[PDB]
Amino acid sequence: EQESVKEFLAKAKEEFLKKWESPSQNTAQLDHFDRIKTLGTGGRVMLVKHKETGNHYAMKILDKQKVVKLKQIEHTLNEKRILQAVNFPFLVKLEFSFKDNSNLYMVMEYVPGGEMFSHLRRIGRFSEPHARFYAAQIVLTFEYLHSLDLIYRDLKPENLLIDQQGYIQVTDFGFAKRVKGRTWTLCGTPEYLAPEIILSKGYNKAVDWWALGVLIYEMAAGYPPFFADQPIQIYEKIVSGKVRFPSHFSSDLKDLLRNLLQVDLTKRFGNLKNGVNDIKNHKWFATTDWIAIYQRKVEAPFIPKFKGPGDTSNFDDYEEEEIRVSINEKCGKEFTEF
Amino acid sequence: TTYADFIASGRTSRRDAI
Ligand SMILES: O=S(=O)(c1cccc2cnccc12)N1CCCNCC1
C-alpha cells in the first residue's frame, strides 16, 4: 500500500513536469463564450456559456494593466502555469486559456456549489465528521502538491469550492510557489499565517500543515483559533503558543490540533520523519477510508442545492461591468508566456 | 463568549490576503 502511493506520486510527478516544461497556450478566444453572471470579484470570475457546446465554465478575467500596477505579474503567470500542469480530483480543472489586448483569461470547470465560506457562515459550524470529510481531502491534496514541491500558502474556506457531489475543489494558486526547500515571502491571510511566516524566518511546506490546523479548527468551531480586531493583534496570538478550544471539541480533535498548530515547526505534524502519515494515522482520522475519499466513493455529508447547468444560486451577487478590450495591446512583453 | 468576540472582531466576512 505504501509502494502504491510511491508509484502513484512518481507517475504524477512525470506528468506534471511534462506540462510544467511545455505549458499550453491560446486554446480558445473570447467570442467562443457568452457571459452570464459575475461569480466573484477581486480581476473577476464569470459564469460563461461555451456557444458551440452549451457547456458552462467559470472564466477568470485579469486586467493586464491592473496586474502590472499591483505587482502581480509573476504570481499571475505562475498560477496559470500551475493550473495547466496539475491533475488531482480536488483541484479545479483548467479547460482553456488565452489573452487579448487588455486581459488574461483562464476558463475553468464551473463548480456550482459555492465557497465553503458561505456554507460555514450560514450553518455556523460543521460537526466533526463533516469537518473530517473536508479535512481528508485537503490532506490528500497537500500530499499531492508537496510531492511536486508546491507550497500552497492560501488555505481558507474562501478558497475552497464545493462541487455537485459535495467534494472540495481548490481553485486559487496565485500565492503557490514551486520550491524544494525554504522560502521567505510574507504572504497569505492573517488568520491562517504560520508563526514562522509572521516572524520573518525562512519557512517550508510545513506552513501548509499549520494552515490545515487553522482550517479544521474554524470548520469545527465556526471561528478560527486566532482572531482580533487588527492583523497585528492576530499575529501576537499566533506566535504566543497558546490556543483555546470550544468545550464540544473531542479529545482526539484537540490532540490533532495541538500537533498541527505547533509553533515549533520541528515538532509539527506533517513535518516529522513520517511526514503526512502522522496525520493520516492520527486517531481523529481512524474512520477515514483514504482510498475511498480519493476515489470519491464516500457519501458526502452535505450536497449543495443545484437546479441545473448554469444555476448560480450558491454564489452571491456582484455589480456587472463591461469586459472591455482595447484597440491597443497592453503589456505584451510582460505576459508573453501566458 | 468566544463567538461574541468573533462577531465583534469585524473579521467575519471574506478575508483578503495580505
Ligand atoms: O469562486 S470563484 O469566483 C471561482 C474561481 C475559480 C474557479 C471557479 C469555478 N467555479 C465557480 C467559481 C470559481 N473564486 C475567485 C477567488 C476567490 N476564491 C474562491 C474562488
Nearest-Cα residue of chain B relative to residue A42: B16
**Which one of 3.30.200.20, 3.90.226.10, 3.40.605.10, 3.40.50.720 gives the CATH number of domain A23-114+306-338?**
3.30.200.20
Task: Sheet containing A44-50: give its strands across.
Answer: A33-41, A44-50, A56-63, A103-109, A94-99
Experimental determination technique: X-ray
- How far, in Å, CA of A165 to CA of A338, rounded? 32
DSSP secondary structure letter of residue A274: T
A23-114+306-338: same fold as A1-22+115-305? no
Selected catalytic residue, list A63, A154, A163, A208: A154
- Neighbouring residues of A111: CB distance < 8 A, sequence distance ≥ 6: A58, A92, A161, A162, A163, A169, A171
B3, A221 in Cβ contact below 8 A? no
A228 touches chain B (CB under 8 A): yes
Query: Which of B8, B12, B17 minimises the CB distance to A154?
Result: B17
| Closest to A138 (Cα-Cα) out of A70, A217, A39 | A217
| Closest to A25 (Cα-Cα) out of A111, A118, A99, A130 | A99
Q: Which CATH class is domain A1-22+115-305?
A: mainly alpha
Cα A167 to the center of its chain, rounded Å: 13
What are the sequence ranges of the domains in chain A?
1-22+115-305, 23-114+306-338
CB-CB neighbors (< 8 A) of B1 in chain A: none
Query: Which of B5, B10, B17 minimises the CB distance to A188?
Result: B17
Q: Residue A220 corresponds to which cell in the numbers above?
A: 469545527
**Smallest CA–CA separation between A291 and chain B, in Å?**
32
Q: How far is CA A81 from CA A86, A97, A130, A141, A144, in A?
A: 9, 10, 33, 18, 17
Answer yes or no: A154 catalytic: yes
CB-CB neighbors (< 8 A) of B16 in chain A: 189
